[PDB]
């Protein structure tokens, strides 16, 4: 929305795919952290 309301330039589904791709980018960096954690030093339940 910021890009829309700042695009004073007359001419700046693919956009929706790009939105989902950006969300996937951030979440996927966290997925990388999570997966490294889970198969390198998995958590455990301890009594």
């Amino acid at each position: 929305v910021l890009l829309v309301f700042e695009a004073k330039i007359p001419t700046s589904w693919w956009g929706l795919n790009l939105q989902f791709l950006l969300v996937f980018l951030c979440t996927f960096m966290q997925i990388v952290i999570c997966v490294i954690w889970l198969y390198t030093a998995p958590p455990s339940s301890y009594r």
């Binding site: 929305v1 890009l3 829309v4 309301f5 695009a7 004073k8 330039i9 007359p10 001419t11 700046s12 956009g15």
Partner: protein, 223 residues
């Protein structure tokens, strides 16, 4: 480069040079708001073009107007940013013909996407007329007596309530055209206009930017 194609190497150099200038002109073209002035003969587009002749361009964004006879060429181009329809509301009888012209402009399916930056022009002379007794709208548009000044339609301080009644009557007679055809793909923005007014230009720029935003709001489906 290796430069090994002889006459063809000269041709390659020429083509690369031409492509460089094509990109250089694309820099200007992709940023220019192109606008057309469908002003009537009596409308008063002379005032606007005189103001533009004074100094068009705003900040760093460029603007390019065209002005202008039957229109077999108005439908040929749909890349225009918006239409600037000067109207001389001072002449009441020619006002109806201007309203019909705006009907034709707004209902042209070829320019369906195109918004219009409407100008009620020479409205000060309308004030001079209506303060006098000669000018009677009841003869030409009889519905003026049936009209009421809208408190929503914000007036200007130090203005005759009958002046506002008349002026708002002209403008909403024009805006009946826009609101009736609420297509959304194109909106009409009216602005009161007068001669010897350097401010007119910035209004266009303002309005222009607005349309662009809506177009983006249309591409990204936000609106």
């Amino acid at each position: 480069g290796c430069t090994l194609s002889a006459e063809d190497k000269a041709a390659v150099e020429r083509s690369k040079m031409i492509e460089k200038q094509l990109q250089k002109d694309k820099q200007v073209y992709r940023a220019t708001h192109r606008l057309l002035l469908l002003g009537a003969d009596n409308s008063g587009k002379s005032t606007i073009v005189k103001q533009m002749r004074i100094l068009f361009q705003v900040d760093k964004v460029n603007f390019h107007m065209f002005d202008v006879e039957r229109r077999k060429w108005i439908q040929c181009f749909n890349d225009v940013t918006a239409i600037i329809f000067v109207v001389d509301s001072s002449d009441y009888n020619r006002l109806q013909e201007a309203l019909n012209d705006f009907k034709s402009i707004w209902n042209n399916r070829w320019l369906r996407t195109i918004s219009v930056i409407l100008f009620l022009n020479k409205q000060d002379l309308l004030a001079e007329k209506v303060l006098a007794g000669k000018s009677k709208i009841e003869d030409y548009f009889p519905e003026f007596a049936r009209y009421t000044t809208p408190e929503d339609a914000t007036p200007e301080p130090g203005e005759d309530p009958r002046v506002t009644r008349a002026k708002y009557f002209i403008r909403d007679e024009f805006l009946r055209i826009s609101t009736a055809s609420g297509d959304g793909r194109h909106y009409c923005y009216p602005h009161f206009t007068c001669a010897v007014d350097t401010e007119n230009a910035r209004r266009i720029f303002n309005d222009c930017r607005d349309i662009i935003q809506r177009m983006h709001l249309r591409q990204y489906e936000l609106l």
